[PDB]
Design a protein around this ligand. Structure first.
Ligand SMILES: Nc1ncnc2c1ncn2[C@@H]1O[C@H](COP(=O)(O)OP(=O)(O)OP(=O)(O)O)[C@@H](O)[C@H]1O
Ligand SMILES: Nc1ncnc2c1ncn2[C@@H]1O[C@H](COP(=O)(O)OP(=O)(O)O)[C@@H](O)[C@H]1O
Ligand SMILES: Nc1ncnc2c1ncn2[C@@H]1O[C@H](COP(=O)(O)OP(=O)(O)O)[C@@H](O)[C@H]1O
Lengths: 24, 370, 370, 49, 370
C-alpha cells in the first residue's frame, strides 16, 4: 500500500506477535 | 547617483552605478623622480603618479604607496586621489556618496583615518567602503561561496554561506605576485642581468605576466627542459637584449604552492584554502567544493586551476565533487560588483553621512562600514 | 461538516497532524528550537529565523536547535505557538484556530499547569472551538482493534506503560519511567569521544541521532558476544569519514535495560511491566499475559522484541502467551486512532467546548479528561 | 505566483548574470499593495452585515 | 632499592617528571620538539637537529617548534620518542628505563589507542620493570589530603573539572572541554592582527607566550570596563620594541566564558562546574562549596577567582561558603603528590607487570586502570 510507501517504513521480514516454546 | 571607485595597491579603478567598464584604470603607485642638486629650467610636477610617472619612467621611481594594506603616506595617497578625480572625472566629491574598498587585518585606525580625511578633504554627502570578496561573489551570483584574493600584495580565503560567514573561517595571508616579482628579478639577476631601479620591476612584472604559465611537476618539466631547451623561449626587451627562459616562466608561480622558495614557515595556497574549508560544517564544505570560486588579479595564469583542483582532489575524498568557478575577469569584477551594489536602492538607503562623524565620531565606522 | 477536527499527534521529539478519518498524517516533522548564528552582508538569505523544513534541515550550520520538551514537558510554549502558527502555514494548514475542533495527543501524569497553559494558548492566542487531549493508549487499542491491554511505549527520552482493561479506572496500576534514546545518542557521542570523536553542536548531535537510529541493534548475548570479535564496519560522514560499528550500537542500547550504568537506579522496561502485572489482579493476569500491547517508535531496533521475550521468559512464570502489538507504524497508529476517534458521534460530548473555557475551563478540563 | 518551479526558473534566469529580473518582479508585482488595500477594506467592505 | 620509581609529570603545557621522596623539582622543560632551520658548511656549529633546552630557548630563529601533542594527545609518537630520549639523557635521566619503575600522569577521557601506543614504546622499546599512569587530578588530591574534590584546571589546551569524594568516581559527573592557553596565545595574536603585528613564527610564538605570561591581569566587570577609554602604556619587548598595554589582555580570558566570540559553543567553566554540582546530591553540594580546588597554572591572574566567585553568586543560591589559599606551587603540586604516591607501600600493586603486558597488554591495563 502507499501507506507504507509515503512513510519511512513498517516491519521488515518480522511479524508482530510471537510465541513461546511448545509446552511452557 | 553614486561614485564607484575600486581600489588596489596597483590597480585602482572608478566609474559609477550601472557602468560596466571602469572609467579610471591606472597603476596606483607613487612615482618619485631623481631630484638632483644642480639647476634646471621650465620645471615639472613634484612627483608624477602612476601613468604620469610611467610616461617619464626614466626618472620617475614608482615606489609603493601601500604595503599589503600598509599605506605609507596618506598625503601622497590623497594626491593620487585628487588628481585621479580631477584627471578622470573632474567632478567634485559633494555630488554623490563615494564607494571604496578595503580588506581585513587592517588596524581600525587606518579605516577611521581614511574616512575621516574623506570627509575632511572632500566633504562628500555620504560614503561607503567594503570588502572586495563581497563584490566578487556578489558579481558571481552566489550567497554561498569560497573565493580567494590574489592581488598585487594580498591573499585571502573567504567562505560564505547564504551571505553568512565567519571571521574565524575566513583566512588570510597578505602575500602576492609582488614577492614573485622580487624573486623573479633576483633570479634573473643571477642569470646575469642588471636590475636596479623600479623600471626593472616594471619590465619584469610585465614579462612575468607574459610568461607565468602553470605546468604540473617541475621535476619532469625540468628534466624535459634540460633535455630539450626548446621550451626556453626568447624575448627581446625594449632594449636590444633578448633573454631565454623556460623553467623560470612557470616555476616562478610555484612559490605560491611552496613557501620553500622563500622559506616563509608557511603553507601552500591549496592546503591553506583547505584549512579554511576545514573550519566549517561537513555539509557546507561539500558546497565549497561545489562553490570553488576564484578571484584575484594574480590568478590570470593558465593551469593553476587544474593544479589546485588536483591538490584538493588528493586532499578531499573522491565523493567531494570539485566544481571550480574560474572567471578570467575577476580583476575588474570587483569594481563591477561595486556598481551593481550601487544599483540596489536599499543599500543606497544605508549610508555614512556627515553628521555621523560630526557627532558620532568614528565608532560608526566600526559598526557601519561593515 | 467542513469544520473537521484536527488530530495532532505529539511526541517528545516527533509530531504529526491531520484531520478526522484521514489515514496518513500529511504533516510529520520534529520538535525543536532554532535561530541563526552568523552575519550576512549581502542580502538574499532566508528570514523568519525559526525554520521548519528542508531549509531547517539544510541550514543546520546556522540555527541553534534546542528542545523545550524536557521529557516532553515543554518550557518554550511561546516558541511552540510560533511552531503552531507554522502548523497553520500557507502550505501547512491555512485554517484558523476558530475553525476546527482539535484533538491532542498526550503523555500522562503531568502537572495540571501543563494543560492550563495549553488551554490558555488554544483558547486565548489560538481560540479553538473544541479542544481535547487524551491518552494515546486508547487510540492505540483503537488502531489495533483490541480493547484491553498493557500499552507500553517509548518516545525519545520518555517511556511508559498503561495496563488497563477497556479504559477502566486503574491509576494505581500504571507505570512510567521517562528515559530513552536522546541520552543514548549523547552516550554514543560519549563513546565517540572515548575513541576520539568529539561533537557538540545541535546539528552535529542530530547527525549523531541519525547515526544511532540508522545504525543500532541488540546482541542477545552481552557477555558472550562481547567475548567474540565485532566488525566495526564504517559508515561515512557527509565528507566521508570513519564511522565504525564498535561495541556501541548494541552495548549502548542495553543501558535501557541496565539503567544503573548511566548512574541512576531504575528498573528496566521488563521489570517495570512486571511490576505493572503485579499492580494488576490475579483474576485478570492471565489475560494480561496475553495482553502485550507494545508500541514506541524508539523500540524499532534489531534484537529487540524476541530478546525482550527471552527477558520475559526469565521473568514471567510458566504458561505465558506472547501476543505483541508490533508494526513499525505504532506512532502513526496513535494519530490514526485519534483520527477515527475524532470521526465519532459521542465525540462531541467527549471534547471541551470553547464556552466552557469562557466560563471556567481548568477544573472542567480536568473533569472531562477524567 | 508561489509556484516554486516558476520562481526556480526565475532564479536560473537571474543567475545567468542578468539579475535585473527583480526589478519587474517587484515593481509590477504590487500584489501585496492591493492585498493590504483590500485588508484596509476588510473591516468595512468585507464582513459587511 | 636503587631503582627509584620514575615519576613522569606530562601535562599539556607544563611538562615535567620526577622520583619518589625527592620532593623538590628535578628538571623543568617545555612541551615541544626543536627542528633546525637553516644551513651552512662552515665549522664551529652544533649538529643533531633535535635540539631541546638552552640552545632551543636560545636559538629560536634557528629551530622550529613542533607540537605533536594536541590537547594532551600526541600524533607523531616518534617525536615523543625523541623527547623521551632527551629524558633518557644522562644529563637528564642518568639511568635506564629498564632499571627503574615508572609512574606517569595523564588527563582522563583520552582514547585508549594513545595509551596502547605509549605502552608499546614503554615496554617494547624499553623493557621498563614497572609502570602505571593515572589522572593528574588524583595526584593533586593526594597532594592535598581532602578525600573530596572537584578538580578544576587547565594546562595550555584543556579545561577540566573532576568531582569526587573519597575516590568515588562518578564519570557522568566529571566533565572536560579541550581549551586553554594555546588559544590564549592565538587570541593574543588575534588582537595583534587587529593592530597589525604578525607574529607567526615558532620564535614569534614564544614571544607571544612571553607576552601571555607577562602582560596579563583581569577585571571583574566585562563591559563596564570594556566600553571605557584605555591608557595602553607601552612595554619594552625582548627585541627593543615597546608596545601598548591593551585592554585585550584581560579581554582574552573572557573568551573562555564566551567562546561564541571565537565561534565554538561551550557553556562556561564555572557553569559546567555547577552542572557537576547539580549532578551531585544536596548534602554533598554543601561540601562542594566547602571543597573548592585551586588547580591549573593558567589561572594566575589578578582578581581571577573574584570574578569567578561573582559568577557563583549569580548562579548558586545562598549559604555558600567558599574560601582562599596562599598557594605555593599550584603546578608542581600534582607531581609532588604523585611523588609521595610513588613513595608508598601498597603502591606496588598499582603498576603493570611487564610480563603481563607481554601476555595480554593494553586491554588488561584498561580494565585494571580506571
Ligand atoms: N592580466 C594579468 N595577467 C597576469 N597577472 C596579472 C594581470 N593583471 C594583474 N596581474 C597580477 O595582479 C597584480 C596586480 O594587481 P591586481 O591587478 O591584482 O590589482 P590590485 O592592485 O592587486 O588590487 P588589490 O591591490 O585591491 O588586490 C600583479 O601581481 C600581477 O602579477
Ligand atoms: N530507525 C529507528 N529505529 C528506532 N527508533 C527510531 C528510528 N528512527 C527514529 N527513531 C525514534 O523513534 C521515536 C518515535 O517515537 P515517538 O513516541 O514518536 O517519539 P517522540 O515521543 O519523541 O515523538 C523518535 O523519537 C525517534 O527518535
Ligand atoms: N601566569 C600565567 N598566565 C597564564 N598562563 C600560565 C601562567 N603560568 C602558567 N600558565 C600556563 O598554565 C599551564 C599550567 O597548567 P597545568 O595545571 O600545569 O597543566 P599542564 O601541566 O598540562 O600545563 C601551562 O600550560 C602554562 O602555560
Amino acid at each position: 500500500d502507499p501507506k507504507y510507501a509515503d512513510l519511512p517504513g513498517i516491519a521488515r521480514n518480522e511479524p508482530d506477535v510471537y510465541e513461546t516454546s511448545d509446552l511452557p | 547617483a553614486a561614485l564607484v571607485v575600486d581600489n588596489g595597491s596597483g590597480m585602482c579603478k572608478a566609474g559609477f552605478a550601472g557602468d560596466d567598464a571602469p572609467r579610471a584604470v591606472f597603476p596606483s603607485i607613487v612615482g618619485r623622480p631623481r631630484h638632483q642638486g644642480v639647476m634646471v629650467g621650465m620645471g615639472q610636477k613634484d612627483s608624477y603618479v602612476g601613468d604620469e610617472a610611467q610616461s617619464k619612467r626614466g626618472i620617475l621611481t614608482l615606489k609603493y604607496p601601500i604595503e599589503h594594506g600598509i599605506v605609507t603616506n596618506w598625503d601622497d595617497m590623497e594626491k593620487i586621489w585628487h588628481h585621479t578625480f580631477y584627471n578622470e572625472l573632474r567632478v567634485a566629491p559633494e555630488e554623490h556618496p563615494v564607494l571604496l574598498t578595503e580588506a581585513p587585518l587592517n588596524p581600525k585606525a587606518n579605516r577611521e583615518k581614511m574616512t575621516q580625511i574623506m570627509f575632511e578633504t572632500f566633504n562628500t554627502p555620504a560614503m561607503y567602503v567594503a570588502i572586495q570578496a563581497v563584490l566578487s561573489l556578489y558579481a558571481s551570483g552566489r550567497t554561498t561561496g569560497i573565493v580567494m584574493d590574489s592581488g598585487d600584495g594580498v591573499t585571502h580565503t573567504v567562505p560564505i554561506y547564504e551571505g553568512y560567514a565567519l571571521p574565524h573561517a575566513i583566512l588570510r595571508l597578505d602575500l602576492a605576485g609582488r614577492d614573485l616579482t622580487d624573486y623573479l628579478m633576483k633570479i634573473l639577476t643571477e642569470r646575469g642581468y642588471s636590475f636596479t631601479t623600479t623600471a626593472e620591476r616594471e619590465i619584469v612584472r610585465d614579462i612575468k605576466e607574459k610568461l607565468c604559465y602553470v605546468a604540473l611537476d617541475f621535476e619532469q618539466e625540468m628534466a624535459t627542459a634540460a633535455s630539450s631547451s626548446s621550451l626556453e623561449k626568447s624575448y627581446e626587451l625594449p632594449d636590444g637584449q633578448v633573454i631565454t627562459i623556460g623553467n623560470e616562466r612557470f616555476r616562478c608561480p610555484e612559490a605560491l604552492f611552496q613557501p620553500s622558495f622563500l622559506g616563509m614557515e608557511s603553507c601552500g595556497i591549496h592546503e591553506t584554502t583547505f584549512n579554511s574549508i576545514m573550519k566549517c560544517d561537513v555539509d557546507i564544505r561539500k558546497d565549497l567544493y561545489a562553490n570553488t570560486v576564484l578571484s584575484g588579479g594574480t590568478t590570470m595564469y593558465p593551469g593553476i586551476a587544474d593544479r589546485m583542483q588536483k591538490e584538493i582532489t588528493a586532499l578531499a575524498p573522491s565523493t567531494m565533487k570539485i566544481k571550480i568557478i574560474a572567471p578570467p575577469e575577476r580583476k575588474y569584477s570587483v569594481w563591477i560588483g561595486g556598481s551593481i551594489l550601487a544599483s540596489l536602492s536599499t543599500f543606497q538607503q544605508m549610508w555614512i553621512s556627515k553628521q555621523e562623524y560630526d557627532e558620532s565620531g568614528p565608532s560608526i565606522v566600526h559598526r557601519k562600514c561593515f | 461538516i467542513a469544520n473537521q477536527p484536527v488530530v495532532i499527534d505529539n511526541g517528545s521529539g516527533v509530531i504529526k497532524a491531520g484531520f478526522a478519518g484521514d489515514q496518513i498524517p500529511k504533516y510529520c516533522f520534529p520538535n525543536y528550537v532554532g535561530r541563526p548564528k552568523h552575519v550576512r552582508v549581502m542580502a538574499g538569505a532566508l528570514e523568519g529565523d525559526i525554520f521548519i523544513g528542508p531549509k531547517a534541515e539544510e541550514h543546520r550550520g546556522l540555527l541553534s536547535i534546542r528542545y523545550p520538551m524536557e521529557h516532553g514537558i515543554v518550557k518554550d510554549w511561546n516558541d511552540m505557538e510560533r511552531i503552531w502558527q507554522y502548523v497553520y502555514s500557507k502550505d501547512q494548514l491555512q485554517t484558523f484556530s476558530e475553525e476546527h475542533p482539535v484533538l491532542l495527543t498526550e503523555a500522562p501524569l503531568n502537572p495540571r499547569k501543563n494543560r492550563e497553559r495549553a488551554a490558555e494558548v488554544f483558547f486565548e492566542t489560538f481560540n479553538v472551538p473544541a479542544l481535547f487531549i487524551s491518552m494515546q493508549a486508547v487510540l492505540s487499542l483503537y488502531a489495533t482493534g483490541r480493547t484491553t491491554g498493557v500499552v507500553l511505549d517509548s518516545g525519545d527520552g520518555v517511556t511508559h506503560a498503561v495496563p488497563i482493561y477497556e479504559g477502566f479506572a486503574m491509576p494505581h496500576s500504571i507505570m512510567r519511567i521517562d528515559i530513552a534514546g536522546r541520552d543514548v545518542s549523547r552516550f554514543l557521542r560519549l563513546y565517540l569521544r572515548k575513541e576520539g570523536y568529539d561533537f557538540h553542536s545541535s546539528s552535529e548531535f542530530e547527525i549523531v541521532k541519525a547515526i544511532k537510529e540508522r545504525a543500532c541493534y541488540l546482541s542477545i548475548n552481552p557477555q558472550k558476544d562481547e567475548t567474540l570479535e565485532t566488525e566495526k564496519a564504517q559508515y561515512y560522514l557527509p565528507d566521508g569519514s570513519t564511522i565504525e560499528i564498535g561495541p556501541s550500537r548494541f552495548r549502548a542500547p542495553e543501558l535501557l535495560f541496565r539503567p544503573d550504568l548511566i548512574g541512576e537506579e531504575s528498573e528496566g522496561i521488563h521489570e517495570v511491566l512486571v511490576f505493572a502485572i503485579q499492580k494488576s489482579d490475579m483474576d485478570l493476569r492471565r489475560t494480561l499475559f496475553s495482553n502485550i500491547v507494545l508500541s514506541g517508535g524508539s523500540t524499532l531496533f534489531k534484537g529487540f522484541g524476541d530478546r525482550l521475550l527471552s527477558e520475559v521468559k526469565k521473568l514471567a512464570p510458566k504458561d505465558v502467551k506472547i501476543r505483541i502489538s508490533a508494526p513499525q507504524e505504532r506512532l502513526y497508529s496513535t494519530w490514526i486512532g485519534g483520527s477515527i476517534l475524532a470521526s465519532l458521534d459521542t465525540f462531541k460530548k467527549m471534547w471541551v467546548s470553547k464556552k466552557e473555557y469562557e466560563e471556567d475551563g481548568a477544573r472542567s478540563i480536568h473533569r472531562k479528561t477524567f | 505566483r508561489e509556484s516554486p518551479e516558476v520562481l526556480l526558473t526565475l532564479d536560473i534566469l537571474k543567475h545567468g548574470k542578468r539579475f535585473h529580473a527583480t526589478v519587474s518582479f517587484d515593481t509590477d508585482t504590487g500584489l501585496k499593495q492591493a492585498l493590504e488595500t483590500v485588508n484596509d477594506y476588510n473591516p468595512l467592505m468585507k464582513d459587511f452585515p
